[PDB]
Write an enzyme that holds these catalytic residues in place. Sequence first.
Site, short mmCIF file in Angstrom:
data_model
loop_
_atom_site.label_atom_id
_atom_site.label_comp_id
_atom_site.label_asym_id
_atom_site.label_seq_id
_atom_site.Cartn_x
_atom_site.Cartn_y
_atom_site.Cartn_z
N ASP A 187 86.13 68.58 42.73
CA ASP A 187 85.61 67.16 42.75
C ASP A 187 85.45 67.03 44.19
OD1 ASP A 187 85.82 64.63 42.83
OD2 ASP A 187 87.93 64.62 42.12
N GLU B 92 82.15 62.29 41.90
CA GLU B 92 83.39 62.00 41.41
C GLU B 92 83.35 61.13 40.49
OE1 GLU B 92 86.70 60.84 44.44
OE2 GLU B 92 88.05 61.74 42.98
N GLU B 93 82.84 59.84 40.80
CA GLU B 93 83.26 58.93 39.92
C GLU B 93 82.63 59.45 38.53
OE1 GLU B 93 82.60 58.56 43.06
OE2 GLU B 93 82.94 56.44 43.97
N1 LIG Z 1 77.46 67.45 39.25
C1 LIG Z 1 77.22 68.19 40.22
N2 LIG Z 1 77.16 69.36 40.53
C2 LIG Z 1 76.79 69.97 41.59
N3 LIG Z 1 76.61 69.30 42.61
C3 LIG Z 1 76.46 68.17 42.44
C4 LIG Z 1 76.73 67.25 41.34
N4 LIG Z 1 76.53 65.94 41.63
C5 LIG Z 1 76.26 65.58 42.95
N5 LIG Z 1 76.07 66.92 43.51
C6 LIG Z 1 75.66 67.31 45.07
O1 LIG Z 1 76.55 67.43 45.96
C7 LIG Z 1 76.57 66.36 46.69
C8 LIG Z 1 77.73 65.29 47.03
O2 LIG Z 1 78.09 64.36 46.23
P1 LIG Z 1 78.84 63.16 46.56
O3 LIG Z 1 79.90 62.61 45.44
O4 LIG Z 1 77.89 62.15 47.46
O5 LIG Z 1 79.72 64.06 47.54
P2 LIG Z 1 80.46 63.61 48.92
O6 LIG Z 1 81.71 64.50 48.95
O7 LIG Z 1 79.30 63.81 49.84
O8 LIG Z 1 80.68 62.18 48.59
C9 LIG Z 1 82.12 62.01 48.59
C10 LIG Z 1 82.34 60.40 48.34
N6 LIG Z 1 81.56 59.82 47.23
C11 LIG Z 1 82.29 59.78 46.04
C12 LIG Z 1 83.76 59.97 46.08
O9 LIG Z 1 84.76 58.92 46.09
C13 LIG Z 1 84.15 60.43 47.71
O10 LIG Z 1 84.59 59.30 48.14
C14 LIG Z 1 75.39 65.42 46.19
O11 LIG Z 1 74.62 64.54 47.05
C15 LIG Z 1 74.68 66.56 45.45
O12 LIG Z 1 73.64 66.84 46.42
#
Ligand SMILES: Nc1ncnc2c1ncn2[C@@H]1O[C@H](COP(=O)(O)OP(=O)(O)OC[C@H]2NC[C@H](O)[C@@H]2O)[C@@H](O)[C@H]1O
Length: 521
Positions: free
Chosen positions: A296, A314-315
């Site tokens: 996550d 995450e959300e």
């Molecule tokens: N299901 C799934 N599988 C694989 N990779 C993914 C997926 N969803 C997104 N991603 C990739 O990973 C990247 C990261 O997603 P993100 O939630 O933006 O991760 P971060 O750690 O950069 O963001 C963290 C923050 N956002 C929501 C949480 O509350 C954190 O505070 C996103 O831009 C995509 O390139």
Amino acid sequence: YVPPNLPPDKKWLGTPIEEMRKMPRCGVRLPLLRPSASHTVTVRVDLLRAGEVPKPFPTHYKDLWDNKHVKMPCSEQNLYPVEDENGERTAGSRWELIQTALLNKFTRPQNLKDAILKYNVAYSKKWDFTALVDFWDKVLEEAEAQHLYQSILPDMVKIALCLPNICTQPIPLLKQKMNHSVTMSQEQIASLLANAFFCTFPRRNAKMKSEYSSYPDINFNRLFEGRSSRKPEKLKTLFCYFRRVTEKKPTGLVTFTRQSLEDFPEWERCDKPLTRLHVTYEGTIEGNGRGMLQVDFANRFVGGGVTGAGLVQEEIRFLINPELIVSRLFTEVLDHNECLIITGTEQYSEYTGYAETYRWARSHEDGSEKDDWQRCCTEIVAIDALHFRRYLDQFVPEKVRRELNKAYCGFLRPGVPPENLSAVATGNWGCGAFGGDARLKALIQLLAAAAAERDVVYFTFGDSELMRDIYSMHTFLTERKLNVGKVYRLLLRYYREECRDCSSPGPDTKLYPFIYHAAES
Ligand SMILES: Nc1ncnc2c1ncn2[C@@H]1O[C@H](COP(=O)(O)OP(=O)(O)OC[C@H]2NC[C@H](O)[C@@H]2O)[C@@H](O)[C@H]1O
């Protein structure tokens, strides 16, 4: 050194996916699930049988109203002040108040609101309900919204108000530095979340710094506010849950474990070698990491903005597996050396899109076979990256050392023989909203996994150049026989040389080029 051009049609590289270790098949025989000093178990383990909703232990409601446990709403200490005959103040049971507030038909949205606010009076004139009011009347049709108010909401109120006979055992708070586990029934979680939905939990709303200032939101109040368009898709996804668990009481168990590691690798010296890699630009972690350790991309306040704002990695995970949301009831913020590991949650919905493309797709009948403890075979770990404001910041060793440690803490499973541990199913951790570089985290992760003796599976989420560069680097480091140590050392050789003294907002030479050049050229 310019990297060798690889099969241009192929969707994945490295070790074939079906050769990576995965639970339940790779798992050690779980022992008698007993409660202990470090493991709270809130169900009858002796009576625990496949298909049968677990009986809660102990049989009758025992309350603790303190600073070591969740402050349950139904506690006889959840009070509000009341005038009597004479005007002198006494305390009224807030629980009773809640009960008699929610035992009414909700034939309009205004009613549900009136209801929630009847106990939350301090927030009469602070809580926006547009999103809900909109959802009910405009987004849901006569047909759907009829099924919602004579059926789902009343069913939710039933399990909500059954809480004291469902969560009979006090739930301890997973505080900072605790290495502790809680395991409770899917049913128990649905009761709590039903409560969460009705904004029932006491002392969890202060704008002012409170006892629970250190914990994420848990009441669903924020899902009701705003003119935001993604709120409804959120509602659709959570109701999918509330409808599935009210109609058919779930029979599984779920475990939350906080992990704090006080002692880390001396990365400069780390002798352990790189592990096996599988990297692909198709798939998703939840979609394809069936049986592996699914990461996550967490906020330090676990669950991120699930109860209101956010709707990214995450959300989303927290909406399709709503049982994860309850983690917020009792998990303090993560310090830099901590994580939350949740084994057992189920996937109730499928989706399409991302952020403001997010749509609720359909209901998902989770396929995962259960383990020895009647927990689904899916283990999520929530690890929080740093939210890098300036792009160069992340190459400072301190920033690399840290992201390395977090990743490690999330992967390491002390005591466990490596040959039992599954692969880690991850992707672009911290390289979205947290704005870090994917090529670096990729490496960092790959180094941490190495140190953890867990093989990796990276989903680049569409980015196929990344799939190659990732792979290219992994195979380059491996054939040249390099350990975690040297690979770390170079990362700092990168800082000192291109980053430490950098005029521009970006260096002249990207990381992989530099590493390739700096080892064998
Ligand atoms: N299901 C799934 N599988 C694989 N990779 C993914 C997926 N969803 C997104 N991603 C990739 O990973 C990247 C990261 O997603 P993100 O939630 O933006 O991760 P971060 O750690 O950069 O963001 C963290 C923050 N956002 C929501 C949480 O509350 C954190 O505070 C996103 O831009 C995509 O390139």
